[model samples]
Target: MLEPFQILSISSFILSALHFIAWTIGHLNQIKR
Candidate 1:
């Protein structure tokens, strides 16, 4: 089982990745349109 800290770390990593992907997509869309 994972510790609480480990879970939180993974969650934060996923959040950061999602945030990056979202911003990248938005920027690309703006450039295209």
Candidate 2:
């Protein structure tokens, strides 16, 4: 069983990673225009 802190850490990591990916794609689209 995972600890509560561990679960929160993993969730935050995934969210940050997803946000970074989305930001990168948005930047690319803006540059392509």
Candidate 3:
């Protein structure tokens, strides 16, 4: 069973990853324009 802290950590990791991916895509698009 995963601990609560572990779950929160995983959630934050996923969220951060997604945020980074979106930010990178947006930045690249802006640069291409």
Candidate 4:
């Protein structure tokens, strides 16, 4: 069985992963080639 605290921990990781991906893409898009 999964622990509730573990779920929260993984959820935060997923959020940061996605956040960094979005930040990277947004930064790349904003720069002129």
TM-scores of the candidates in the order shown: 0.64, 0.62, 0.60, 0.64
TM-score comparison, 2 vs 4, better candidate: 4
- Residue lDDT tens for model 3, 1-33: 679788998899999989999998888988898
Cα lDDT tens digits for candidate 2, 1-33: 679788998999999989999999888988898
List the candidates ranked by TM-score, beginning with the highest: 4, 1, 2, 3
lDDT of each: 0.90, 0.91, 0.90, 0.88
Model 3 residue runs over 4 Å out of place are 28-33
Q: Model 4 shows how many backbone clashes?
A: 0
Rank by lDDT, descending? 2, 1, 3, 4
Per TM-score, the best of the predicted structures is 4
Per-candidate clashes, comma-separated: 0, 0, 0, 0
lDDT of 1 at 25: 86
Q: Given candidate 2, what's the lDDT at residue 22?
A: 92
In model 1, the worst 10-residue window by lDDT is: 1-10
Q: Candidate 1, which segments miss by more than 4 Å at Cα?
A: 29-33
Candidate 4 structure, TM-score to reference? 0.64
> Which candidate would rank higher by TM-score, 1 or 2?
1
lDDT of 2 at 10: 90
